[PDB]
Design a protein around this ligand. Structure first.
Ligand SMILES: Cc1cc(C)nc(Nc2ccc(N)cc2)n1
Length: 281
């Protein structure tokens, strides 16, 4: 059981050591499309690339490339699209992907500015009356409502395909209190946030996969998917303590490189799953 394994690694201070075995054991697959010169300005970080096998393709004939990966968790019956915070020049691609994949939710785990630098383009409208048009992808986005709480904000958005005049409601879940350095002290507000996303239906098989991002789409985004999948496997299995976090992380790393960036994020993931299990048993 992970609670005992937690105390062991903690009392022995072996988090860097565990984290390094995961690094060593992690899959490495080609990411050739990401490295084409014509895609250089579609990537926020040159060392964070989707694998060719799991990459989301835009349905535009010109250039189908976005920095985004489909993570398919077969046993949990859960999919996620992990992506980078959009760039000024990829905001239109981002909303095209949301449209094409029939996503119901967008989960944002960063602030637009952290440590005095921009981590993300402002890719949604700030006021009801000031809608955004993406000319390149022929999409209109409107803020319908905004519910600001202490730890997160939920926004209702309307996405309109200007080509076909179809419209969809998208939910934007924005966790606003992840600290600039390190991880939250307690996983309570993160778990609350996760249960809120679940309650919306955004993670449900009726809909396309949820879009999850932070700045690179590997660190905080990683913790979100790892926690959700581990808690769901604990509901589903005859023996809940058969769930090995490290195994689940390695399975997710076949789909996108670098998920969980630090030993601190790994420790936090254990804590999130351990605490979430109480509210599930
Ligand atoms: C109608 C309207 C008015 C304004 C000021 N912007 C937009 N669209 C937009 C496109 C690309 C980026 N990066 C950001 C915004 N659309």
């Amino acid at each position: 059981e992970m609670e005992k394994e937690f105390e062991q690694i903690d009392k022995s201070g072996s988090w860097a050591a565990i984290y390094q075995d995961i690094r060593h054991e992690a899959s490495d697959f080609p990411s050739r499309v990401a490295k084409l010169p014509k895609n250089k300005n579609r990537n926020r970080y040159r060392d964070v690339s989707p694998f060719d096998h799991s990459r989301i393709k835009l349905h535009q004939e010109d250039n189908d490339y976005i920095n985004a990966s489909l993570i398919k968790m077969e046993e949990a019956q859960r999919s996620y699209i992990l992506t980078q915070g959009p760039l000024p020049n990829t905001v239109g691609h981002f909303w095209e992907m949301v449209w094409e994949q029939k996503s119901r939710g967008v989960v944002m785990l960063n602030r637009v500015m952290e440590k005095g630098s921009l981590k993300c383009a402002q890719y949604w409208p700030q006021k009801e009356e000031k809608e955004m048009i993406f000319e390149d992808t022929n999409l209109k986005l409107t803020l319908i409502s905004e519910d600001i709480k202490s730890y997160y904000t939920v926004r209702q958005l309307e996405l309109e395909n200007l080509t076909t005049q179809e419209t969809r409601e998208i939910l934007h879940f924005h966790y606003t209190t992840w600290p600039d350095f390190g991880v939250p002290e307690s996983p309570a507000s993160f778990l609350n946030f996760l249960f809120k996303v679940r309650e919306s239906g955004s993670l449900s098989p009726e809909h396309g996969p949820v879009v999850v991002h932070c700045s690179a789409g590997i660190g905080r985004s990683g913790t979100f998917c790892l926690a959700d999948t581990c808690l769901l496997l604990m509901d589903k299995r005859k023996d809940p303590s058969s769930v090995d976090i490290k195994k689940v992380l390695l399975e997710m790393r076949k789909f996108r490189m670098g998920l969980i960036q630090t030993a601190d994020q790994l420790r936090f993931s254990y804590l999130a799953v351990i605490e979430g299990a109480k509210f599930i048993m």
